[PDB]
């Protein structure tokens, strides 16, 4: 039979970087309620650059979702260990897309969630990132396949402005693949 | 019992910090080996060119910041890890 | 509290200059680590061959130009970054 | 103001020769960094093994031939480039 | 018989621990060469710059923690392996 599968908001195809982030085992998925979102343009392998952010998140008490180029090694292991220990309900995933599109999708997620993307080109550093810098969303569901953010706490005027910018990019575009990715 | 010779010191390294300042558990490279350790024994003193032995400024039972390197040597006493290093290698003794 | 040993000095490095002389914000390598830092503690003094301790020319609470190298050692006191280095490593103390 | 420590010297390097002896303008590697610089400050003096400080033979306000190397350190004072180096690094002081 | 010269010491290395603390037999790299050895002979003493010989702090018949390196030299006396090393190489003498 013909089936229809509709997904709202962001559902970019990136799953949990570590299977042990699963909060709900019977569903095999991470479920975060009202979590912060830390959007990092760089790839991270050490916990030092993020330690202030994790400490602030633990002080706040709410969960945290990391959207990054790659979290691996010491940083990933420390995040996972903290996940069991329960100090911070932290889940990490790869940023979506590839070069020159990963940044755009990260910025759209930032606009949706009312956050800011941490990058070296922009100038800010992760050691100086704050809770206000971190984004906010009402719910988050990660699985091995896809990451979904539900009701990102972001300005509607900003979301429409970003949508209009992407529309202008679609108009400027002359490639079917480029315009369908923009859409 | 082990007590050192000349300008040297026996130091039991302090346990690595399991958690960070804000309560974040540190693992692997994050929980780096501590550079601070208590002094278990103190040597008689360094020998100067004239042949006299000067007592060391390090005392027994005080915490000391020490530098890991070629000078420091790892040893086991009563199945406990200790380090042996010259008083020059000892950066500073911690007070309070 | 931490106070150093022998000819050595505890120095808290000054914050890197965020902006240039003309007001241009410096980032990354442009905002290089400052070679100037305030002296938090001063050692008893260097030990000469004869066994006498000479007080150091560095005083507590003065800014000093110091050279980063193998001699300088990074440490954390009350969760604050400090450096430990011999008085020879200290280039000069800043006045006025 | 900055004044050096021990056997060391603050030297403001002279400007590189724009033109050659015959009037040919030198550019790039031709206009090499000058090894001669005026002395802005002089240290208290080198410390001998016995603990006494010997005044340096370099005086303030005299031009000195100095060798660039690992010993010399570049610094900025009032947004002006200066060098810091031991009196041994200073080859000679220029007179007349 | 062999007795050393100057600041040096003859040390017969102790046999490597066949078993661990809990009774586990250690083989190959696990049964590493012991850094502790008994002192068979002691030198006359190190020579200072002034020409006087200072007796060494190491005595005959005491166990000493020694560092294997370029200084230590392997030798055979009455078909028994011994080591020759300066008193500086000897980390510490074991008591009790």
Is the CB of B92 less than 8 angstroms away from the CB of C50?
no
What 3-state class would DSSP assign to D73? strand
Confirm or reject contact between C69 and chain B (CB < 8 A). no
Instruction: Report chain A's terminal Cα–Cα distance, integer Å.
Output: 28
Contacts of C70 (CB under 8 A, 6+ apart): none
Report the residue of B30, B37, B50, B92 to disrupt the C interface, i.e. the one with the largest count of C CBs within 10 Å.
Answer: B92
Distance CA(A47)–CA(A134), nearest Å, equals: 17
Partners of B19 in the beta sheet? B25
**CB-nearest partner of E93 from B5, B50, B79:** B5
Confirm or reject contact between C6 and chain B (CB < 8 A). yes
Tell me which residue has tokens 């049964």: E31
Confirm or reject contact between D75 and chain C (CB < 8 A). yes
Measure in Å the smallest separation between the Cα of B21 and chain E Cα atoms. Answer: 36
Measure in Å the smallest separation between the Cα of C78 and chain D Cα atoms. Answer: 30
Task: Return the H-helix or E-strand segment holding B29.
Answer: none
Tell me which residue has tokens 């912060």: A36
Confirm or reject contact between B82 and chain E (CB < 8 A). no
Instruction: Tell me, yes or no, whether A1 lies in a domain.
Output: no
- Burial of residue E61 (CB within 10 Å: 0-12, 13-18, 19+) is exposed
Tell me which residue has tokens 């420590």: D5
Partners of B50 in the beta sheet? none
What 3-state class would DSSP assign to B7? coil
Picking from C11, C6, C3, the residue whose alpha carbon sits closest to that of residue C94 is: C11
Instruction: Tell me, yes or no, whether A166 lies in a domain.
Output: yes
Picking from B76, B80, B68, B71, the residue whose alpha carbon sits closest to that of residue B33 is: B68
Measure in Å the smallest separation between the Cα of A56 and chain B Cα atoms. Answer: 8
Partners of D19 in the beta sheet? D25
SS3 track for chain A:
CCCCCCCCCECCCCCECCHHHCCECCCCEEEEECCEEEEECCCECCCCCCHHHHHHHHHHCCCEEEEECCECHHHHHHHHHHHHHCCCCEEEEECCCCCCCHHHHHHHHHHHHCCCEECCCCCCCHHHCCCCCCEEEEEEEECCCCEEEEEECCCHHHHHHHHHHHHHHHHHCCCHHHHHHHC
On whether the CB atoms of residues C84 and C4 are closer than 8 A, the answer is: yes
On whether the CB atoms of residues C96 and D10 are closer than 8 A, the answer is: no
Q: Which two tokens stand for residue A82?
A: 């903290």
What 3-state class would DSSP assign to E17? coil
On whether the CB atoms of residues A23 and A140 are closer than 8 A, the answer is: no
Chain C residue at shortest CA distance from B55: C51
On whether the CB atoms of residues B64 and B94 are closer than 8 A, the answer is: yes
Distance CA(A9)–CA(A110), nearest Å, equals: 13
Distance CA(A159)–CA(A9), nearest Å, equals: 12
What 3-state class would DSSP assign to D54? strand
Contacts of A167 (CB under 8 A, 6+ apart): none
Q: Where are the domains positioned within chain C?
A: 1-96
Distance CA(E3)–CA(E13), nearest Å, equals: 16
Tell me which residue has tokens 């020319």: C57
User: Following CA atoms C61, C31, C24, A51 in sequence, which dihedral angle do they give, to the nearest 10 degrees?
Assistant: -90
**What's the longest Cα–Cα distance across chain E?**
53
CB atoms within 10 A of CB A127: 12
Phi-psi region of A85 (alpha: psi -120 to 50; beta: other; left: phi over 0): alpha
DSSP at D14: P
Structural biology method used = cryo-EM
Instruction: Tell me, yes or no, whether A79 lies in a domain.
Output: yes
Is the CB of C57 less than 8 angstroms away from the CB of D5?
yes
Measure in Å the smallest separation between the Cα of B20 and chain A Cα atoms. Answer: 8
Phi-psi region of A147 (alpha: psi -120 to 50; beta: other; left: phi over 0): beta
On whether the CB atoms of residues E5 and E21 are closer than 8 A, the answer is: no
The resolution in Å comes to 2.5
On whether the CB atoms of residues E85 and E58 are closer than 8 A, the answer is: no
Q: Which two tokens stand for residue A128?
A: 């100086």
Q: Which two tokens stand for residue E13?
A: 């290395």
Confirm or reject contact between E95 and chain B (CB < 8 A). yes
Instruction: Report chain E's terminal Cα–Cα distance, integer Å.
Output: 27
Distance CA(D72)–CA(D23), nearest Å, equals: 31
On whether the CB atoms of residues D63 and D14 are closer than 8 A, the answer is: yes
CB atoms within 10 A of CB A171: 10
**CB-nearest partner of E48 from B1, B51, B75:** B51
Chains touching E (3+ CB pairs < 8 Å): B
Chains touching B (3+ CB pairs < 8 Å): A, C, E
Distance CA(B96)–CA(E76), nearest Å, equals: 52
Report the residue of B14, B46, B91, B96 to disrupt the C interface, i.e. the one with the largest count of C CBs within 10 Å.
Answer: B91
Q: Which two tokens stand for residue B74?
A: 């790892």
Q: What angle in degrees, to the nearest 10, is found between the helix axes of A102-113 and A156-172?
A: 150
Contacts of A175 (CB under 8 A, 6+ apart): none
Picking from C63, C86, C83, the residue whose alpha carbon sits closest to that of residue C75 is: C83
List CB contacts (< 8 A) between C54 and chain D: 47, 51
Measure in Å the smallest separation between the Cα of C24 and chain B Cα atoms. Answer: 35
List CB contacts (< 8 A) between B44 and chain E: 57
**CB-nearest partner of B21 from C47, C79, C84:** C79
* Radius of gyration, CA atoms only, chain B: 15
Distance CA(A48)–CA(D71), nearest Å, equals: 34
Distance CA(B82)–CA(B72), nearest Å, equals: 10
Buried b (16+ CB within 10 A) or exposed e, A9-27: ebebebbbbbeebbbeeee
Write out the residues of chain B at the interface with chain A, using a CB-CB cutoff of 8 A: 20-30
Confirm or reject contact between D4 and chain C (CB < 8 A). yes
């Amino acid at each position: 039979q013909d089936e229809l599968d509709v997904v709202e908001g962001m559902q970019f195809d990136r799953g949990y970087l570590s299977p042990y982030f699963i909060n709900k085992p019977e569903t095999g998925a991470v479920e975060l309620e009202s979590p912060f979102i830390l959007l990092a343009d760089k790839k991270i392998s050490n916990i030092r650059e993020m330690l202030p952010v994790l400490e602030a998140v633990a002080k706040a008490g709410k969960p945290l979702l990391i959207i990054a180029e790659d979290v691996e090694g010491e940083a990933l292991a420390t995040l996972v260990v903290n996940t069991m220990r329960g100090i911070v309900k932290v889940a990490a995933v790869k940023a979506p897309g590839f070069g020159d599109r990963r940044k755009a999708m990260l910025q759209d997620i930032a606009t949706l969630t009312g956050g800011t993307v941490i990058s070296e080109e922009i100038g800010m550093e992760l050691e100086k990132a704050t809770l206000e810098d971190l984004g906010q969303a009402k719910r988050v569901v990660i699985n091995k396949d896809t990451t979904t953010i539900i009701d990102g706490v972001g300005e509607e005027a900003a979301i429409q402005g970003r949508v209009a910018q992407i529309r202008q990019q679609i108009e400027e575009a002359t490639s079917d693949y480029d315009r369908e990715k923009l859409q | 019992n082990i007590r050192p010779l000349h300008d040297r010191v026996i130091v039991k390294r302090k346990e690595v910090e399991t958690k960070s300042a804000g309560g974040i558990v540190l693992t692997g490279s994050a929980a780096a080996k501590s550079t601070r350790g208590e002094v278990l024994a103190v040597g008689n003193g360094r020998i100067l060119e004239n042949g006299e032995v000067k007592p060391l400024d390090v005392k027994v039972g005080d915490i000391v910041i020490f530098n890991d390197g070629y000078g420091v040597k790892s040893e086991k006493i009563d199945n406990e890890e200790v380090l042996i290093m010259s008083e020059s290698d000892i950066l500073a003794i911690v007070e309070a």
